[PDB]
Structure 1
């Protein structure tokens, strides 16, 4: 059917490549008409957003919207969640604030985002903590929203895990702190690994207090999501060099592959619904001139594209409106004060490039040295027995200690 791809970008992705992208793709045409209309927009204010979306819905009954963004403001998607409730059009969010993840939607909304929920991201972070055997942790929580659901998901994850976690007291913060009560709350911490769910503005103040309170030793660790750690363009000096973050912002999976996957999902859902239902094009007439009780359609793609696979890519969507097997990237803040890809996440497996975990010791220029002792050994039958990892927990059992074996492929 008619599909619009509007991409407000600052990085110059030309529109003719976006038009001719369908050419080398599957041009076999299981629908009788698969047409695309590519557009650009340099002002993403919501008046013009609703104006162009109503123009495209009046533009020969476009049954699918593909929207990306270059700016780093999520509230654009906050408008888009309304637009699915009125235009009744399946809308996919590609880049920027469209790619930024909001929490909860309406059941009469066909709006979806290319990303991952905060619970899937917390599952990835706890999978990191499982794979490095870090069990004693804390939980620093500000009043940035979604925090009670974050605490509840961590508690239900610990209660449904064979790991044997050691959760300390969940640190609560009132407001922008006067360093009086939050002083005592941070001094309640004496563990190693600290989870942090806060805002990008407050993260600098909290980590600056933690560096002032000495909570940034290389014995300690800090794991944050990407909802607080912003883009790569802004890295302040106050962040501890070694900060583990989890983000969906792949750079190999750039905008061309994103819009290719979006068109693939839309055409796959439309083609598979065409083999199930006959009269697939059902669109709203216009945004103008109507009373209440809008003419709702009967057979939509919201109840149908639960399963979708584009050439092996598990691009399926959940019933809540998120990706089933999303793409996540674990990064750190290395010694060059930048962000380097440490490990990509597959359908379930946490692929780790650096199974060796280095120190990332350069937090300050004045720290004590030589506490991790690099110790080598050798297998002997009554002295050192080395076995594989456990299948039940993916964790060495409590008397066994972790090690690594350098296993080569061939010569």
Structure 2
């Protein structure tokens, strides 16, 4: 039917491709009287919003509104929901503040957003934390609402988990902080990874405080949702370089593809409802002077171009494109992870450090440690295929296994390690308080000088890929020449086995 499409001005988006994006497209056009009106608007105030709505609803009875925001105001989606409630016109949130997740839609509304729920996004963030083995965490929230369902979903997920998520309790803030009483709440944090759920300026103030509190370290990770970030074309100040964000503002899922998918959903709903009822165009007359066959109760399971763009009861995409990004060393947001219907397709199995989160950060504690497979000391087992998590009395590790014998390609399969020296490594990590990155050696055994080239754990220490050799290792003169041992902790000489 008659569909209005208005967008912002960001992402180098002109208007002529919006003219050419409806015409030759929609090859399977089942309704007859379908037309589009593509407009733009610099003003993002609700005055101009109500003005353009009353100009386009009377503008030859437009049955569908497509709005795209470029700013970072979450109340614009609330105003669009109010417009969809008053005018009974299906409105699709596309970009910016129009695409931001609001709290509770009306059941008598027709407004829908192209965004994931807070529960699916918390599931993605806990999938990140499970795949990267960051188990002890906390939660800092302000009085900016939507946090109660978030805390409830986190508690029900931890109660329904086989990981064993240790968690210091949720830190709440009272008011606009004087840095007097909320600082006592922030000093309670002694964990590594902190989850932050608040608005944008509140996130700027809290991250500036954590910079002043020294909570932006190498071990101190911050994972924020899309409500913190807002938009990818504007990256503000006082974000640590390595800030993990989960959003969906991708250039790959571009704004032209956004409005094309929106037109596809609208025409699919109108065409599949046209086979049920005849008089599908039934629009509101005017804004002045004061319905059963509606498209709201119909598109629960809608699919265009093979893309599962089905809509939930609360107005969410069932399988959207969740994008996990980080802040690089050059103040940009690099795309790291994409999300399937069930799994999270990651790019870096080993977590990249992003060492300079800020300027003054001496980070000399990411100690790379190699170890060797032995039966009484380093028990190396597969991860549990039913839970995809090492049991908490073990440590994670990786092994570089070459799949194909033809070339030197290989993969870092993550496995579990336990035993005697693993307990030594854990007690050193809990006494000296250092981070450790453990991996198996792939070149072979302990090591031997062959053609004046060391290998094994000795070679990994000498060629500086391994900081220390925690795994089981003997001591002779040549090793004490080429490396330096610690004190001996177990009396292990040679011995003869007989029957």
Check whether TM > 0.5. yes
Per-residue deviation, 1:11: 5.2
Aligned counterpart for 1:299 among listed residues 288, 293, 299: 293
Q: Which moved more, 1:175-184 or 1:346-355?
A: 175-184
**Distance in 1 between the 2:251 and 2:68 partners?**
15
Give 1:142 deviation, angstroms. Answer: 1.3
Contact 2:96-2:231 within 8 A present in 1 as well: no
Which position in structure 1 is the counterpart of 2:428? none
Residues in 1 aligned to 2:128 and 2:137: alpha-carbon distance in whole angstroms: 13
Q: Contact 2:225–2:245 (CA<8 Å) still a contact in 1?
A: yes
**Residue 308 of structure 2 corresponds to residue 314 of structure 1:** yes
How big is each residue's C-alpha offset from its partner over 1:26-60, in whole Å with a ceiling of 9 and x where there is no partner? 33321122222212223233233222222222223
CA deviation after TM superposition for structure 1 residue 400, in Å: 4.5
- Superposed CA deviations along residues 155-199 of structure 1, whole A, max 9, x for unmatched, are 122122222111102111112323332222112111111111123
Q: Report the structure number with the largest CA radius of gyration.
A: 2
CA shift digits 1:297-342 (9 cap, x unpaired): 1121111101111222111110111111122211112222322111
Change (3 A) 1:386 1:157: same
CA 1:47–1:337: 2 relative to 1, 3 Å: closer
Further displaced range: 261-270 or 370-379: 370-379
CA contact (8 A) 1:330 1:344 kept: yes
Cα distance in 2, alignment partners of residues 107 and 35 from structure 1: 28
- Segment of structure 1 superposing worse, 129-138 or 335-344: 335-344
- Residue by residue over 1:192-251, the C-alpha shift from the partner in whole angstroms, topping out at 9 and shown as x without a partner, is 111111232232332233233332221221111121234445545533222211112111
Summarize deviations over 1:64-95 as a string: whole Å, max 9, x none.
11111222222222211111112111111111
Q: Which whole-Å CA distance do the structure 2 matches of 1:14 and 1:207 have between them?
A: 36
CA contact (8 A) 2:232 2:249 kept: no
CA contact (8 A) 1:7 1:41 kept: yes
Shift of 1:258: 0.4
Tell me the distance in 2 between the aligned counterparts of 1:385 and 1:85: 62
Q: How many residues align?
A: 404
- Alignment partner of 2:79: what SS? helix
1:294 counterpart residue number: none
Moved more, 66-75 or 77-86: 66-75
**Residues 1:222 and 1:15: Cα distance change in structure 2 (over 3 Å):** closer
Q: Give the 3 Å change call, closer, same or farther, for CA 89–185 of structure 1 in structure 2.
A: same
Correspondence 1:404 to 2:408 = no
> Does the 8 Å CA contact 1:103/1:117 hold for their aligned counterparts?
no
How far is the alpha carbon of 1:18 from its aligned partner? 1.0
User: Is the deviation greater in 363-372 or in 40-49?
Assistant: 363-372
Q: Residues 219 and 71 of structure 1: is their aligned pair in 2 closer, same or farther, counting only changes over 3 Å?
A: closer
Check the 8 A contact 2:138/2:189 in 1, yes or no: yes
1:306–1:364 Cα change, 3 Å: closer
| Cα pair distance change 1:376/1:316, threshold 3 Å | same
Deviates more, 1:144-153 or 1:363-372: 363-372
The superposition leaves residues 271-316 of structure 1 with CA deviations (integer Å, 9 ceiling, x where unpaired) of 11122223222222222212xxxxxx11211111011112221111
Displacement, 1:350? 0.8
- Other-structure match for 1:246: 246
Q: Cα distance 1:177–1:16, how it changes in 2: closer, same or farther (>3 A)? A: closer
In structure 2, do the counterparts of structure 1 residues 250 and 388 end up closer, same or farther at CA, with 3 Å as the change threshold? farther
TM-score where L is the length of structure 2 = 0.75
1:50/1:370 CA distance change after superposition, 3 Å: closer
- Structure with bigger RCO (C-alpha 8 Å, 6+ apart): 1
Query: Greater shift after overlay, 246-255 or 41-50?
Result: 41-50
Moved more, 321-330 or 13-22: 13-22
Is the contact between residue 342 and residue 353 of structure 1 (CA under 8 Å) also seen in structure 2? yes
CA displacement 1:69-126 (0-9 Å, x = unmatched)? 2222222222111111121111111112111221111111000111223222222111
> What residue number does 1:145 align with?
145
- C-alpha distance in 2 between matches for 1:315 and 1:289: 38
Per the TM alignment, residue 389 of structure 1 is displaced from its structure 2 partner at its CA by 3.8
Give the conservation status (yes or no) of the 8 Å contact 1:76–1:97. Answer: yes
* Cα distance in 1, alignment partners of residues 263 and 253 from structure 2: 15
> In structure 2, what is the Cα distance between the partners aligned to 1:407 and 1:60?
65
Note closer, same or farther for the CA distance 1:408–1:262 as it changes in structure 2 (3 Å cut): farther
- Mapped to 1, the partners of 2:73 and 2:136 lie a distance apart of 35
CA distance in 2, matches of 1:167, 1:79: 38
CA contact (8 A) 1:142 1:174 kept: yes
Residues 259 and 277 of structure 1, relative CA distance in 2, 3 Å threshold: same
Distance 1:35 1:386, change over 3 A: farther
Write the distance in 1 (CA, Å) between the matches of 2:359 and 2:11: 38
The corresponding residue for 2:133 is: 133
Is 148-157 or 367-376 further displaced after alignment?
Answer: 367-376
Q: For residues 154 and 328 of structure 1, what CA distance do their matches in structure 2 show? A: 19
Tell whether the 8 Å contact from 2:6 to 2:66 is kept in structure 1 after alignment.
yes
Aligned-partner Cα distance in 1 for 2:363–2:392: 28
